[PDB]
Amino acid sequence: PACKYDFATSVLFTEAELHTRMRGVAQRIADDYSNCNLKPLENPLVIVSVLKGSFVFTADMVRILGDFGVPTRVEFLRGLCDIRGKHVLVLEDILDTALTLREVVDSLKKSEPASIKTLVAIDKPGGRKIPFTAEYVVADVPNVFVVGYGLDYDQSYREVRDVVILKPSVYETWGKEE
Amino acid sequence: ACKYDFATSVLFTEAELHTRMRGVAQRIADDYSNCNLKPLENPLVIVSVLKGSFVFTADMVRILGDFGVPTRVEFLLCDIRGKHVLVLEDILDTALTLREVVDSLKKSEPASIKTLVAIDKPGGRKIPFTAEYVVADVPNVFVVGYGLDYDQSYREVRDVVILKPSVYETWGKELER
Ligand SMILES: Nc1nc2c(ncn2C[C@@H](COCP(=O)(O)O)OC[C@@H](O)P(=O)(O)O)c(=O)[nH]1
Numbered sequence: 153p154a155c156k157y158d159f160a161t162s163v164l165f166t167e168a169e170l171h172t173r174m175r176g177v178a179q180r181i182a183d184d185y186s187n188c189n190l191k192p193l194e195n196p197l198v199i200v201s202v203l204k205g206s207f208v209f210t211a212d213m214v215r216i217l218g219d220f221g222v223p224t225r226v227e228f229l230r231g232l233c234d235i236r237g238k239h240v241l242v243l244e245d246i247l248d249t250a251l252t253l254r255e256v257v258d259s260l261k262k263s264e265p266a267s268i269k270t271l272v273a274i275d276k277p278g279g280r281k282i283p284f285t286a287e288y289v290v291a292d293v294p295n296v297f298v299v300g301y302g303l304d305y306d307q308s309y310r311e312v313r314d315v316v317i318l319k320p321s322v323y324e325t326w327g328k329e330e
Numbered sequence: 331a332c333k334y335d336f337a338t339s340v341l342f343t344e345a346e347l348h349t350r351m352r353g354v355a356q357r358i359a360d361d362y363s364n365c366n367l368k369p370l371e372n373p374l375v376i377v378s379v380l381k382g383s384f385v386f387t388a389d390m391v392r393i394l395g396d397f398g399v400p401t402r403v404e405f406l407l408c409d410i411r412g413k414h415v416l417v418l419e420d421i422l423d424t425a426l427t428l429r430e431v432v433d434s435l436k437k438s439e440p441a442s443i444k445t446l447v448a449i450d451k452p453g454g455r456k457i458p459f460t461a462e463y464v465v466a467d468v469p470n471v472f473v474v475g476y477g478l479d480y481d482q483s484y485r486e487v488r489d490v491v492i493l494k495p496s497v498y499e500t501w502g503k504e505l506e507r
């Protein structure tokens with residue numbers, strides 16, 4: 153068969169596949185935090201959106217979370233104010249070397265929250281520079297460079313609804329920054 | 331009878347918004363047809379203003395993609411000189427925010443500037459300002475949902491709703507002793 157995008161070698165996860173998984177994740181999150189007594193305004197779940205591309209994943213997840221009765225409050229680190237004593241769920245579009253999430257988590261602990269967990273959309277477990285495990289993972293991809301669903305190559309292809317493998321010909325031809 | 335114990339009524343549903351956003355996307359595609367927009371090289375620079383516009387931005391760029399409009403996003407810049415700029419904002423009221431942003435972006439000499447808002451409140455203007463693209467209009471009422479908040483809450487509400495007056499009153503919890 154052939155690929156749908158002329159800039160991609162293959163499609164790893166469609167928008168439908170992602171959303172389907174995100175409901176399963178949201179179900180578990182709804183169960184885990186059911187004993188935290190989460191309420192809008194009073195005690196909402198503080199969603200920390202790390203990296204610029206995570207705005208697509210964050211926008212979809214919080215609405216799916218809202219369907220499962222989980223009140224949220226967003227902060228963007230693309231912050232560390234008024235999180236003390238509250239629950240913090242760090243959201244990130246992708247995870248491999250785990251260097252980004254590690255520093256953020258260790259930085260949020262300084263403000264001393266009620267709890268802190270991480271939720272990623274795409275996890276590349278074979279890319280770790282340090283040991284790290286996200287409490288919630290939507291999907292796993294091998295060590296290949298992907299774009300779409302917020303993930304970019306030089307600020308492009310974020311708006312792609314599917315997580316696809318970027319063609320090698322694309323990011324070598326665009327190697328013109330010189 | 332809307333399914334919201336914290337809202338009195340639903341002004342626009344998620345389905346209604348998306349339907350309108352496709353219609354806007356069709357016009358945006360037609361208008362920027364002579365701009366030669368391509369990924370990487372010359373994409374349409376989306377400038378998302380306000381914190382709660384991330385929901386509207388996330389959906390719109392994907393809908394813009396469906397209609398063949400390549401985009402890159404910046405959140406509120408440099409590297410916009412000579413490039414077409416579309417400024418997105420979740421809501422438009424007094425138009426004090428967009429007026430400042432648009433005028434500030436003009437200093438960087440872009441190819442063109444237009445504005446796209448999801449919810450326009452024409453009767454809330456403190457200064458005159460007209461957006462090129464408007465998804466929906468609402469009268470002078472305070473709304474939440476689709477990125478719009480009340481004290482950082484209710485952004486995750488899929489629909490644009492009017493909060494029940496009991497919400498602010500119960501949230502009158504002034505236990506600051
Ligand atoms: N598109 C894409 N990006 C990747 C991929 N692998 C790593 N990255 C970079 C990532 C680093 O974060 C992970 P980590 O190493 O910190 O764990 O940062 C994203 C920034 O480009 P953004 O646009 O600001 O979000 C990948 O396969 N695809």
Ligand SMILES: Nc1nc2c(ncn2C[C@@H](COCP(=O)(O)O)OC[C@@H](O)P(=O)(O)O)c(=O)[nH]1
Binds near residue numbers: 380381423477479
């Ligand atoms: N929820 C809600 N907010 C409104 C409404 N009218 C104005 N605002 C504030 C807006 C100001 O922008 C318009 P303007 O006066 O600049 O034209 O800014 C929003 C940031 O507070 P956010 O939470 O980061 O999105 C409304 O009906 N509902």
